[PDB]
């Protein structure tokens, strides 16, 4: 559809500008390997994921028209899912990062479900457009805590879901299951809200300096 193609190109122009700075990528190879240096790298990565996702969010069609408090509630409420999704994308476009994660002092209670999500979404071989649309769909969720005008958010989310589904008919014709499989990775993704809340209470994790952006977006 003519209005849908315009929507999609707008999403892609914004999504394609997102990149993790090469300098962080180099750190994966170049830094000393210790629990503390490893944790720091993951912190800088997480911080940059939020940075990028804010820039992406403020370019989503309609987002600037929303009530200001609702904007904030979206950013904070969708942060955990969006960041986790983005970290899966980064990881799957690496062996070394995995080893750093496995040796950063983070408990296997949290590491295990993380790698299961990464593997699951990796096996789906999602295209750049699927990542972009899903990301936008996660950010524009009308069910976040404290949203005053949920119907306004729903009107921004629904055309993205339509484009995404419709795309799935276009590129994977006669297989309704590709789209349903995308939505099942979203089911895994949402389980991370609870994993995250528990990690923040944990000893190792909370006895660190998180960056200011992480502190703020996670309501620490």
């Amino acid at each position: 559809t003519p209005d849908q193609q315009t929507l999609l190109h707008f999403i892609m122009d914004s999504y394609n500008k997102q990149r993790m700075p090469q300098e962080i990528t180099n750190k994966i190879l170049k830094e000393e390997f210790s629990a503390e240096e490893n944790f720091l790298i993951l912190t800088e990565m997480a911080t940059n994921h939020v940075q990028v996702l804010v820039e992406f969010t403020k370019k989503l069609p309609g987002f600037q028209t929303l009530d200001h408090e609702d904007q904030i509630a979206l950013l904070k409420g969708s942060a955990v899912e969006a960041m986790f999704l983005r970290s899966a994308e980064i990881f799957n476009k690496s062996d070394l990062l995995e080893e750093r994660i496995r040796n950063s002092g983070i408990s296997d209670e949290y590491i295990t479900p993380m790698f299961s999500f990464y593997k699951s979404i990796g096996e789906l071989k999602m295209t750049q457009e699927e990542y972009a649309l899903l990301t936008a769909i996660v950010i524009l969720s009308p069910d976040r805590q404290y949203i005053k005008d949920r119907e306004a958010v729903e009107k921004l989310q629904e055309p993205l879901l339509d484009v995404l589904q419709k795309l799935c008919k276009i590129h994977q014709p006669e297989n309704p299951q590709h789209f349903a499989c995308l939505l099942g990775r979203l089911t895994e993704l949402r389980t991370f809200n609870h994993h995250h809340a528990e990690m923040l209470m944990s000893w190792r994790v909370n006895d660190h300096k998180f960056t200011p952006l992480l502190c703020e977006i996670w309501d620490v």
């Binding site: 804010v54 403020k58 200001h68 904030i72 950013l75 200011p212 952006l213 703020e216 977006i217």
Partner: peptide, 7 residues
């Protein structure tokens, strides 16, 4: 405040 600034 941080979030509003970046937005």
């Amino acid at each position: 405040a941080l979030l509003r600034y970046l937005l």
